[PDB]
């Protein structure tokens, strides 16, 4: 019953010309009936991207703040994101946490506000290499997930994304089995701490390295319900990742 | 000689398409003197939208940007994207970036260097908090901030410096026109001493923090105050009175 979920995080990449070309490819692509597709453009192009993209693709903001309006130069609110036609926001992404210092407390508050305002949330968690090697993977990801869970009432509006931050330019990489074991642990957490119905119906998506060559094996893992895709999301290869269950 | 009067409107995180449409309609209708250079900084989601609706007489600015052209920086925008949306300016080092979101001087310096290399103009913001003001060290704080910016500028024709008394914002304290002029004079002296006399005399140093339609005239007439970076008042028709502060 869990609908396969493929998020494309464009990060800080592209211009109207190149992203227009990419959107033409995604508009033309056949999306499977069993798959939900979301694209997260740079904040300057949420509006542009929603206008050009076909309704079969939903649009996500890459981040947002925790009040509707205010003196927060450089921020955007859930209200603005909806006003541009986007229905999702990515929150707690590893880059926000570890490049820009976004705390769990702040991220939990963003989740609550985004959800209260009617957005759906891709909520990102994950451990760094020092944390994984000290043995505290479970501790880190369960705690991050708890802060998210404290600020979620309706889990039908949420997707969890596991980011193996330990495998980003570190000299280590995650196997499909290593991805699967974290994913099953997280699903057990949902069963244990909220509901068996929530555990079974919540998409837990893989946010580590995924390509067209690697996506089918990763998607076949029982507790991996799709991907939050990085670099490949800017290429036609993204459509191969959309087709990962076919 | 003669520094062109500069009025920037920082909308911050305010407005939607419809309410900003109404604000933009009010701005388009208003008389903008050729004396004045007007720039508006919409929320990042509406840079493109604002540029399409605004009359070309008003320039559009981003409220922040990052320091590379493209990369793995979820939630950031680059100068390339800002230019691509038709905006010509970027606000950098704003007090909220520095003190709410922890942006360091080093980071802000790097953003300045990149923005200018990419063909954007920069409103570079500086200013001291109340604990720094009450401890007698505003010069040290604002000069050091100005030095890091200065180190990353090669064309001062494309830069505007904005003094933001953070000490007189949300603290129950008022900054008088003499206090503003005191900081602006010393900043102009810094540029003379440390860059060149050509840069000191040609560069706009604008004032931020509680600019109203009543207070603007007396602030504008101060010899080293070359204009304004307006916050809350930039969402109101009162902004037009600040544009006409010299008139």
From Swiss-Prot, chain A:
It comes from the Eukaryota. One of its GO terms (cellular component) is extracellular space. It catalyses: D-glyceraldehyde 3-phosphate = dihydroxyacetone phosphate; dihydroxyacetone phosphate = methylglyoxal + phosphate. The modification 3'-nitrotyrosine is found at residues 65, 206. One of its GO terms (molecular function) is methylglyoxal synthase activity. Pfam families: TIM. Its main location: cytoplasm. There is a cross-link at residue 139 (Glycyl lysine isopeptide (Lys-Gly) (interchain with G-Cter in SUMO1)). The modification N6-acetyllysine is found at residues 11, 153, 191, 235. The active site is at 93 (electrophile), 163 (proton acceptor). GO terms for biological process: canonical glycolysis; gluconeogenesis; glyceraldehyde-3-phosphate biosynthetic process; glycerol catabolic process; glycolytic process; methylglyoxal biosynthetic process. Keywords: Acetylation, Cytoplasm, Disease variant, Gluconeogenesis, Glycolysis, Hereditary hemolytic anemia, Isomerase, Isopeptide bond, Lyase, Methylation, Nitration, Phosphoprotein, Ubl conjugation. InterPro entries: Aldolase_TIM (IPR013785), TIM_sf (IPR035990), TrioseP_Isoase_bac/euk (IPR022896), Triosephosphate_isomerase (IPR000652), Triosephosphate_isomerase_AS (IPR020861). The modification N6-methyllysine is found at residue 191. It is found in: Cytoplasm. CDD domains: TIM (cd00311). The keyword Isomerase applies. Triosephosphate isomerase is an extremely efficient metabolic enzyme that catalyzes the interconversion between dihydroxyacetone phosphate (DHAP) and D-glyceraldehyde-3-phosphate (G3P) in glycolysis and gluconeogenesis. It is also responsible for the non-negligible production of methylglyoxal a reactive cytotoxic side-product that modifies and can alter proteins, DNA and lipids. Belongs to the triosephosphate isomerase family. PANTHER family: TRIOSEPHOSPHATE ISOMERASE. It is linked to Triosephosphate isomerase deficiency: An autosomal recessive multisystem disorder characterized by congenital hemolytic anemia, progressive neuromuscular dysfunction, susceptibility to bacterial infection, and cardiomyopathy. This is Triosephosphate isomerase. It comes from Homo sapiens.
